[PDB]
Design a protein around this ligand. Structure first.
Ligand SMILES: [Zn+2]
Ligand SMILES: [Zn+2]
Ligand SMILES: [Zn+2]
Lengths: 114, 46, 266, 134, 65
């Protein structure tokens, strides 16, 4: 009756772009990224591989409301390091890890029988 | 094909008359039902 | 071999039981979240009921129809219902399947999953075969008909995702363990007299040497070594299940990169 | 799950768990007064019949009642009857403002006094929503 | 009513097993639990989906209309 249509959870509706960048006031160089149509599947990995980076200081993701589908990711890094570049590096690290894992698993699979 | 009203005891296809009582000749009872319209449902199977 | 390492200890048509090694804790959780919730597949999103006389109300039957395991091996060729441009569906959008049955004998004739009939074009794709794993040769039982009843309808299978509905989800049955003895000390063992005797040790213990108990707690430890088994549902075999999950994960991650590089404007 | 409340598996609900069939059996009859003046089951005419309901009757068939396959919602009339005057006026039987579903079937049978008499069964699949009482 | 097609939580396809279930006790004279073990129904969430249910549609079928 009142439920949001199930496609509202993974497909971006009218006037809702994927990301947003907002510099955080009352803080050093720091930014919040307002995701859309994103569950914790993505955010928790972005946070983990972000934390593995040495240079980054602050990395967190919070689900404002599991009612809706958005979670906010905040990052702050030492001056001179654009945090969006840190996000890009963490994402590319995740992607290369995934690709190597895929080839590894395929090699392990083809040998197996039954 | 076209089937306007049916009855419960025997599934008899009987298009029925206006200004008429409710009675099935072959069944003998007086209970009758209506039948599906040709416009078919759209079903979010969900 | 350049990073994530996987050892496989057993595998089958339905199951693959394996060690995963040398990755962060969170990654496996996110990956199973993906394949459980995000892999695209194919199942019914619309049923045009022609005529029904079975006991079951066709709402019920439509729900049963949605859950039929439809083979989606080459489905990446297929395009989403919403994305594609056919009016509400065509051979590029959807795969239509007829269905009809009648009361042959006084002995109740059941309608198995087998009696579904493909109508739509295939253009070589291996999409729309309702897979059947039973030995007798006929899978899901949908309804039973006595001699009198008749059941005819026409379902329109569409591409979907496990997020929107549960039909479009291919595994749903995956094991997960990552520490035999809680050497990471993540859990606190409830017990009456002794934790060990009142707790069955995991069967995956044989590969990891048990603690000698002489040593104090290791603070710097983290979670890298996982033991888990994936169970197929039949829509996608396990091998393509895990790989398509990984691919959807990489694609979702990279969609951020694309929206980001777009976010840089004039 | 707070203060005697619970949380349910959305997939299982979508898998079909704890789903419900919910029927309603509306009833009506005509021929009440007698003396050969008599309510008539029919698709009404909007002209000179000013007692029409908010819902329109394009869903109504020729004899004033819809077939057992027509999805219904809101205030879409189910049984349209006309009572004569001494022109006709509406005595139609709308649907409850809150419910919605599918007409399961429609039954006509005369009464012991000889009155035309109808029972309409509407059906809905009601899914376990958020605030339902368990 | 009808045999559930898949277990409500762990997702395994269970619809096809039911009929075999009925014969599995009949000719081989087995307990219910072992017959559930024969069909690979290890997880009790799956294993509870069949035994908990009784096929009531049979009682509906006897009615003529
Ligand atoms: Zn008859
Ligand atoms: Zn199309
Ligand atoms: Zn189960």
């Amino acid at each position: 009756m009142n439920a949001p249509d199930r496609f509202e959870l993974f497909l971006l509706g009218e006037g809702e772009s994927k990301l947003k960048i907002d510099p955080d006031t009352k803080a050093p160089n720091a930014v919040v990224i307002t995701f859309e149509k994103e569950d914790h599947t993505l955010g928790n990995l972005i946070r983990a591989e972000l934390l593995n980076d040495r240079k980054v200081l602050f990395a967190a993701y919070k689900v404002e409301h599991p009612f809706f589908a958005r979670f906010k990711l905040r990052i702050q890094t030492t001056e001179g390091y654009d945090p969006k570049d840190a996000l890009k590096n963490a994402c590319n690290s995740i992607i290369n890890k995934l690709g190597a894992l895929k080839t590894n698993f395929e090699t392990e699979w083809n040998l197996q029988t039954l | 094909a076209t089937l306007k009203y049916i009855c419960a005891e025997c599934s008899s296809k009987l298009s029925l008359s206006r200004t008429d009582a409710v009675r099935c000749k072959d069944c003998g009872h007086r209970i009758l039902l209506k039948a599906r319209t040709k416009r078919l449902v759209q079903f979010e199977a969900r | 071999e350049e990073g994530p390492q996987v050892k496989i200890r057993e595998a089958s048509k339905d199951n693959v039981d394996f060690i995963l090694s040398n990755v962060d804790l969170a990654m496996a959780n996110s990956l199973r979240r993906v394949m459980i919730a995000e892999i695209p597949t194919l199942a019914i999103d619309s049923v045009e009921v022609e005529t029904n006389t079975t006991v079951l109300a066709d709402e019920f039957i439509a729900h049963r129809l949605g859950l039929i395991p439809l083979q989606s091996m080459d489905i990446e060729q297929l395009e989403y219902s919403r994305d594609c441009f056919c009016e509400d569906h065509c051979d590029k959008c959807s795969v239509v399947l007829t269905l009809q049955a009648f009361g042959e004998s006084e002995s109740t004739t059941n309608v198995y999953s087998k009696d579904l009939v493909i109508v739509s074009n295939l253009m070589g794709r291996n999409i729309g075969h309702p897979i059947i794993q039973d030995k007798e040769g006929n899978g899901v039982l949908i309804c039973k008909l006595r001699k009198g009843q008749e059941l005819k309808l026409t379902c329109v299978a569409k591409k979907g995702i496990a997020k929107e509905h549960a039909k479009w989800g291919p595994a749903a049955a995956i094991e997960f363990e990552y520490d035999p003895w809680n050497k990471l000390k993540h859990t606190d063992y409830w017990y009456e007299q002794d934790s060990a005797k009142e707790w069955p040790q995991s069967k995956n213990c044989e590969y990891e040497d048990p603690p000698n108990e002489g040593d104090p707690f290791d603070y710097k430890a983290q979670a890298d070594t996982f033991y888990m088994n994936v169970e197929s549902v039949g829509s996608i075999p396990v091998d393509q299940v895990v790989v398509r999950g990984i691919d959807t994960l990489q694609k979702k991650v990279a969609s951020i990169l694309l929206a980001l590089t777009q976010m840089d404007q004039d | 799950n707070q203060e005697d409340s619970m949380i349910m598996n959305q997939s299982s609900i979508d898998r079909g768990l704890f789903r419900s069939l919910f029927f309603r059996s509306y009833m009506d009859q005509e021929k009440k007064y007698g003396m050969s003046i008599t309510e008539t089951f029919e698709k009404p005419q909007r002209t000179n019949t000013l007692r029409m309901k908010h819902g329109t009757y394009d869903k109504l068939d020729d004899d004033g009642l819809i077939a057992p396959g027509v999805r219904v919602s809101g205030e879409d009339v189910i049984i349209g009857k006309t009572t004569p005057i001494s022109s006709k006026r509406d005595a139609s039987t709308p649907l409850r403002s809150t419910e919605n579903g599918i007409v399961d079937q429609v039954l006509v049978t005369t009464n012991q006094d000889g009155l035309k008499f109808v029972k309409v069964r509407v059906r809905t699949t009601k899914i376990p929503q958020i605030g339902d009482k368990f | 009513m009808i045999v559930p097609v898949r277990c409500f939580s762990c997702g395994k396809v269970v619809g096809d097993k039911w009929e075999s279930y009925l014969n599995l006790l009949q000719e081989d004279e087995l307990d219910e639990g072992t017959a559930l073990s024969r069909l690979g129904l290890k997880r009790y969430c799956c294993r509870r989906m069949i035994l908990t249910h009784v096929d009531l549609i049979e009682k509906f079928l006897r009615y003529n209309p």
